């Protein structure tokens, strides 16, 4: 029962994206607070804010779209699988990839915001190591996203013909999983930066 394992794994990946979104939003809330406190006193934070809203709106849409695809797949599977199940699994990998891409844009905006707050607030040693880690993961995440985009296109083409497909889907599950895990590391790095900025403000 490989197909049934795939659908349930997409459900886990979806839940991971949801929890990751929660934490990501929390970081936005942290950064806006520190930004408001250094502002008064004493912006192109206006365009940051615009860019935050654009991607927050997109990720919300993609999550809901993924929730709807997830229910469809779970239904199709309960009715006896796959023909339309297979296409819905490929589609769900498309949804998850786009949600990962939007979250990545959000992550790079928070990294920027943190660096702006750092330049104003500032010891020097752990921040240089933080910086190197942020650069490595951002760079790692890009090539992981690229690897997912390439596998998605290949999976989609093969779907339009017949079926190798099933192995491509499984490779794509792993591609997505690794992207999320690298993002969770990046997100822990941003949590640590906010926490540190908050700690320095009181000293």
């Amino acid at each position, epitope marked *: 029962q490989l197909l049934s394992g795939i659908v349930q794994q997409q459900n886990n990946l979806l839940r991971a994206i949801e929890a990751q979104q929660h934490l990501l939003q*929390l970081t936005v*809330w942290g950064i806006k607070q520190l930004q408001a406190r250094i502002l008064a006193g004493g912006t192109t934070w206006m365009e940051w804010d615009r860019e935050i*809203n654009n991607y927050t709106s997109l990720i919300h849409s993609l999550i809901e779209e993924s929730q709807n695809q997830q229910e469809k797949n779970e239904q199709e599977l309960l009715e006896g699988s796959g023909g339309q199940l297979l296409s819905g699994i490929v589609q769900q990998q498309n949804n998850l990839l786009r949600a990962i891409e939007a979250q990545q844009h959000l992550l790079q905006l928070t990294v920027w915001g943190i660096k702006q707050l750092q330049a104003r607030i500032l010891g020097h040693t752990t921040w240089m190591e933080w910086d190197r880690e942020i650069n490595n993961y951002t760079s790692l995440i890009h090539s992981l996203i690229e690897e997912s985009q390439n596998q998605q296109e290949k999976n989609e083409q093969e779907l339009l013909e017949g079926s190798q497909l099933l192995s491509g889907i499984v490779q794509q599950q792993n591609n997505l999983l690794r992207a999320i895990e690298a993002q969770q590391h990046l997100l822990q790095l941003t949590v640590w930066g906010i*926490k540190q900025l*908050q700690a320095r403000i009181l000293a």
Partner: antibody
Amino acid sequence: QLVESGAEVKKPGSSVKVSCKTSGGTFNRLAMSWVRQAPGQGLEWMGGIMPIFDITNYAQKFQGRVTIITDESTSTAYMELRSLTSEDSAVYYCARASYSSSSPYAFDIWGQGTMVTVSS
Amino acid sequence: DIQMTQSPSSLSPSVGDRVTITCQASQDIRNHLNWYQQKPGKAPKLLIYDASNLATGVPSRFSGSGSGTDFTFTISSLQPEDLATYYCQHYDDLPRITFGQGTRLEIKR
């Protein structure tokens, strides 16, 4: 998910502590605030927490009398108000911030409220 | 600082009526307004967040509008269970939080 401690009487000079239990267990993944409703009249934000960044915020009018605490081990949040006045008779609510909002102040999950009367 | 004024204080709509409520801010507050619904003896309930967004699971008859200082909350056609006091809430990241005075509903029947 939120559940609050029972209603209380307190003597004028006293301090009151109100508890708020979450079903989830971790405060390190949420923002929450305390809001009161003193008839008469209207809603007043007292303070808020983002425990993951060690952030605690207090409204200016309550600064110096209010403490907000979290306890991971009991998954219970506490607000304490000190130097109780006949002006502090109110219903107190703990509420969770919605993740949908661009700030941690769109309170979508609420406790049942705790009525505090300052008498003697 | 900042000042929020809600209008009106009360309304007497009939079941099936459109009802509109207003909040004005003293200074520009972009989209930082939320609307709540409070039934008597109950806690408030988030209906609208960030000026114009339906909170999940909230019925489609509820909607909100506005940008700088002028904001509007609308129930497209009132249902009997919609009986409640309605509040706007300004938020700032500093943080500053300010609730409006509220609009009470008296259903005509």
